[PDB]
Design an enzyme around this catalytic site. Structure first.
Site, PDB file in Angstrom:
ATOM      1  N   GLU A   1       0.850  -1.084  -0.014  1.00  0.00           N
ATOM      2  CA  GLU A   1       0.095   0.138  -0.013  1.00  0.00           C
ATOM      3  C   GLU A   1       0.911   1.182  -0.027  1.00  0.00           C
ATOM      4  O   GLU A   1       0.910   2.012   0.864  1.00  0.00           O
ATOM      5  CB  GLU A   1      -0.956  -0.082   1.194  1.00  0.00           C
ATOM      6  CG  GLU A   1      -2.120   0.987   1.112  1.00  0.00           C
ATOM      7  CD  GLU A   1      -2.793   1.118   2.362  1.00  0.00           C
ATOM      8  OE1 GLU A   1      -2.564   0.318   3.587  1.00  0.00           O
ATOM      9  OE2 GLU A   1      -4.040   1.815   2.638  1.00  0.00           O
TER      10      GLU A   1
ATOM     11  N   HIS B   1      -4.513  -4.480  -0.999  1.00  0.00           N
ATOM     12  CA  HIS B   1      -4.035  -3.261  -1.758  1.00  0.00           C
ATOM     13  C   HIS B   1      -3.153  -3.837  -2.915  1.00  0.00           C
ATOM     14  O   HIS B   1      -3.666  -3.824  -4.018  1.00  0.00           O
ATOM     15  CB  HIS B   1      -3.554  -2.292  -0.928  1.00  0.00           C
ATOM     16  CG  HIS B   1      -4.268  -1.534   0.224  1.00  0.00           C
ATOM     17  ND1 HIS B   1      -5.281  -0.828  -0.002  1.00  0.00           N
ATOM     18  CD2 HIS B   1      -4.409  -1.827   1.220  1.00  0.00           C
ATOM     19  CE1 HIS B   1      -6.019  -0.511   0.984  1.00  0.00           C
ATOM     20  NE2 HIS B   1      -5.477  -1.076   1.897  1.00  0.00           N
TER      21      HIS B   1
HETATM   22 ZN   LIG Z   1      -7.473  -1.771   4.900  1.00  0.00          ZN
END
Ligand SMILES: [Zn+2]
Ligand SMILES: *[C@@H]1O[C@H](CO)[C@@H](O[C@@H]2O[C@H](CO)[C@@H](O)[C@H](O)[C@H]2NC(C)=O)[C@H](O)[C@H]1NC(C)=O
Ligand SMILES: *[C@@H]1O[C@H](CO)[C@@H](O[C@@H]2O[C@H](CO)[C@@H](O)[C@H](O)[C@H]2NC(C)=O)[C@H](O)[C@H]1NC(C)=O
Ligand SMILES: *[C@@H]1O[C@H](CO)[C@@H](O)[C@H](O)[C@H]1NC(C)=O
Ligand SMILES: *[C@@H]1O[C@H](CO)[C@@H](O)[C@H](O)[C@H]1NC(C)=O
Ligand SMILES: *[C@@H]1O[C@H](CO)[C@@H](O)[C@H](O)[C@H]1NC(C)=O
Ligand SMILES: *[C@@H]1O[C@H](CO)[C@@H](O)[C@H](O)[C@H]1NC(C)=O
Ligand SMILES: *[C@@H]1O[C@H](CO)[C@@H](O)[C@H](O)[C@H]1NC(C)=O
Ligand SMILES: *[C@@H]1O[C@H](CO)[C@@H](O)[C@H](O)[C@H]1NC(C)=O
Ligand SMILES: [Zn+2]
Lengths: 497, 497
Positions: B339, B364
């Site tokens: 992320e 992510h």
């Molecule tokens: Zn999360």
């Protein structure tokens, strides 16, 4: 149990990470011991800036607006190393945007018969008129000599001229905060200079300044897009494109005879993609003729101006296929700007498909290319280099944080890439060092060092359109420059152990 | 190669067709009714893109959610996605998945709720049965008293909401850096922590997650939760097994009430700011709950901001401990990983460790497109990537959502599920806003109902239901889908009467 010990785990981890390092741009280079000393310094500097941004929770300056990052990068060792580094070639440049605005002000606007006016958008425009003041249709033209002399402050007058023309006077990401607003400002810039920069002796001297400035940034070779057309004399005579080409050929030959350390230049004819198909057809036929009669200086054809709102390659497809349909076929090389867009699945990013079906030699930008896996295959298979212009893509609205630049995943896959600067004069960038700095700091990782730089530099000569003899000579020259740069850098940064 | 337009057309369409077959959903064959809806969706998508492109205005689906939320909700594509069954939301945090309005209109109307203004000028909320809380850094006041003395209760309640939501102003303007917006996001959790850990409020909040997700036509959720520390009015603090049992009882009652809902399962999350010795205990705790709550407790994840905190490698002996037992224990992992905008750092290399540790799904994976070998491992093992587009924009990974790094993942058919992450924090719906932005920004103009259908089916096929549960859930999903198609043809007057 797969990983009973730390050594079993790290072995697997290091093999996987190393396998990705072998696959990215430069991953096959083996640095020698002198290069390794410089690489270790570069990597220590790179880790220091990244770990400070990451762990001290502050912005990563190499990735923010060029307006903010330009002055900050220039004091740093990595930038100073890249400045000294031979760049090889700048393969994606526009001829009216590749020398300093300071030279337009300090040299061109000090010539006789230069006039200025404020247009109805409150921007200065510059032109030449030999007969008298130009017609006062949309603005009141005034002789620049008289305005400067009456300004009451000549240095302030000249600085104002520069400030009214540059896109870096303010941060474009703030002042023109949309694609349409910043392209409005970019288009206006060319309108501001169009009159003066098409006057023949100025245009000649401006092209010479491109060569001087690029040489001074340790670039040995350039390929330049130019419309070639409409250069005009004081008496009003307008020259045809072939004359524009001959003029550039003579400047280039003089320059290479003066500077044996410089490989030279070649020209691509560009036409704006706002024109009817009948104009593009005529310019395609023109390009066929120049390619035949100026082999080795005239390279081929490109379509320019903003890609998103204007005509697609498919819109001109009968013109673009005309060379190949001749009997015998005529092979007109193409260097298309293509996929300079955030759009996906549209007429714009599908220009990438047509560019490859038309056998493009290189493609300009290819920002959308990572969204097109089948086009990537063809680009890799055919060796079609992608000309990546990172500062241009940020300032003209394709990306904000340059770590999101769509060429980073291309480089991680070893798609053939060359870095270039596009329109560096428009926003006060150096010929190559600022774009190479942002590519190196934003488009590859923390653990990517001198091998990436060396590969990008070699790529710019390898994927140039030099012939085999020229290319062999240019690479020998580049190797010599590179050796001097390594040795000089070890001394300069006190790395000779 | 192309003597006529027909040959050129054929080659062009073959290449474009190859890409359309390769991308997510490209192998789906739509039936006749679905094709009718598809043609309407595609007409709508083309109209909005072509207006943005040709009339030179911003593409609203890709701008800040603060600006686009009110604009998208009136459009047919949004209304169709709203009605569409979503399947499952597989990436959610349990203190961020119900409406702030419910915290205000329900929780802050309960007895013994206190509020204070902290030193950063934000409201904090908590519960105290045994007198007002100590004035440690702020002055606590009974909400009931503050509300009754406000002179305008509607404005008091709206002020509470406005002081807690991250969509009160545009976060991209008000908190214009990663560290500033994560500072605000972390602050939001601090504002609610006291009130939302009081057991009866936590119980009822979790029920509201299920109610709201069901109302947005989501039939199944997998939820990250810390499970531990829920506290009663008398000060009793409960352990993580109690917290898991509390959620299990709520879910079972909800499914009894609503047989058209498939249910929920729970992932234990721990913040990656803790010493490795404490993560070891949370792994041991997770091994025990996985053994004793099979089919409700799924496994473990590490959360909190990825960039400045501890990497997976920093916890590797704890994370390898289950696999090293005699006999081995397979504790499933659902790691948030990559992320980040960084490349070649400890942070994006968390993706390598996620794969070495056999993660079941990856949260992510924003950096994944920079890692070509990890991509191939993710594809060959079927490790779904949980893509949370509004979260990635508002929390600082991207500005123009057409630059979202999952768009090149979907183009190569990396397995992806769409989810909303923390929708309550910034006033998003359970799934419809994130599915709209994925549909409008992360795939192309020519991508229609097949992409939506594939992502919906993916959310069940890559869930952690067992095989028998998945078959049951897919039968339920098919019936909902069929009703949605028929209803949509009538609602949008597509039946061809
Ligand atoms: Zn999360
Ligand atoms: C180009 O120059 C013009 C003329 O100086 C600038 O217009 C002035 O802008 C200032 C802001 O500094 C305004 O307050 C003045 O009213 C303007 N003066 C006049 C005479 O119009 C204009 O801003 C400059 N444009 C750019 C892009 O630099
Ligand atoms: C949360 O609420 C406080 C208290 O109302 C807000 O404080 C105000 O902030 C503005 C500046 O934006 C000042 O002009 C006011 O004087 C402040 N009032 C008080 C009583 O301090 C604060 O802005 C709110 N925060 C958010 C993020 O909405
Ligand atoms: C963070 O900044 C401090 C000085 O403010 C410095 O001592 C420290 O080394 C920095 N950390 C990193 C990782 O750069
Ligand atoms: C402008 O450049 C030309 C061409 O090199 C040169 O002859 C002339 O002196 C220059 N003008 C000034 C003011 O330096
Ligand atoms: C492209 O190149 C191939 C291989 O050299 C050639 O056969 C073909 O005619 C070319 N196509 C066009 C459109 O020029
Ligand atoms: C652009 O806007 C005009 C005026 O509102 C409208 O008529 C036209 O159809 C729009 N163009 C597109 C392609 O939507
Ligand atoms: C809050 O929710 C609870 C539990 O669902 C309910 O009994 C109560 O009436 C609600 N309070 C308000 C103010 O609606
Ligand atoms: C991962 O999965 C493989 C195949 O199922 C198994 O053999 C291996 O032991 C697992 N590794 C870990 C670290 O759990
Ligand atoms: Zn260009």
């Amino acid at each position: 149990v797969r990983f009973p010990t730390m050594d079993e785990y790290t072995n697997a981890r290091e093999e996987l990470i190393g396998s990705e390092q072998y696959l990215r741009v430069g991953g096959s280079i083996n640095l020698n011991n002198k290069e390794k000393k410089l690489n270790q310094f570069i990597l220590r500097e790179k880790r220091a800036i990244i770990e400070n941004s990451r762990l001290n929770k502050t912005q990563y300056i190499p990735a923010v607006s060029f307006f903010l990052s330009k002055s900050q990068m220039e004091s740093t060792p990595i930038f100073k190393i890249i400045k000294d580094m031979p760049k090889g070639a700048a393969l994606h440049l526009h001829d009216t945007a590749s020398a300093r605005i300071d030279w337009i002000v300090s040299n061109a606007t000090y010539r006789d018969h230069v006039y200025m006016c404020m247009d109805q958008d409150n921007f200065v425009r510059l032109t030449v008129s030999g007969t008298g003041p130009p017609a006062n249709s949309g603005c009141e033209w005034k002789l620049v000599e008289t305005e400067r002399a009456n300004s009451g402050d000549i240095a302030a007058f000249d600085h104002w001229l520069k400030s009214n023309i540059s896109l870096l006077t303010t941060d474009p990401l703030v002042t023109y905060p949309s694609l349409d607003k910043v392209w409005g400002r970019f288009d206006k810039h060319f309108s501001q200079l169009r009159g003066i920069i098409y006057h023949t002796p100025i245009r000649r001297d401006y092209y010479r300044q491109i060569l001087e400035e690029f040489r001074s940034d340790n670039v040995q070779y350039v390929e330049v897009r130019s419309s070639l057309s409409g250069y005009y004399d004081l008496d009003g005579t307008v020259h045809d494109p072939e004359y524009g080409l001959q003029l550039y050929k003579a400047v280039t030959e003089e320059f290479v005879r003066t500077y044996p350390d410089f490989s030279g230049a070649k020209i691509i004819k560009s036409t704006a993609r706002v024109k009817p198909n009948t104009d593009i057809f005529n310019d395609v036929k023109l390009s066929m003729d120049l390619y035949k009669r100026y082999p080795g200086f005239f390279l081929g054809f490109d379509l320019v101006a903003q890609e998103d709102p204007n005509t697609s390659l498919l819109g001109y497809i009968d013109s673009l296929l005309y060379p190949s349909r001749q009997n015998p076929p005529v092979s007109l090389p193409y260097y298309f700007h293509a996929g300079e867009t955030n759009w996906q699945g549209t007429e714009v990013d599908y220009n990438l498909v047509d560019a490859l079906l038309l056998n493009a030699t290189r493609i300009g930008h290819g920002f959308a290319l990572i969204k097109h896996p089948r086009v990537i295959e063809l680009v890799k298979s055919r060796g079609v280099a992608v000309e990546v212009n990172p500062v241009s893509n940020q300032l003209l609205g394709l990306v904000k944080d340059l770590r999101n630049h769509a060429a980073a995943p291309l480089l991680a896959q070893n798609v053939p890439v060359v870095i270039s600067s596009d329109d560096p004069g428009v926003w006060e960038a150096l010929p190559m060092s600022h774009d190479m700095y942002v590519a190196f700091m934003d488009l590859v990782g923390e653990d990517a060092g001198l091998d990436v730089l060396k590969q990008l530099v070699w790529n710019s000569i390898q994927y140039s359109s030099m012939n085999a003899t020229e290319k062999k000579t240019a690479l020998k020259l580049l190797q010599a420059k590179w050796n001097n740069f390594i040795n000089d850098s070890l001394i300069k940064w006190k790395l000779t152990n």
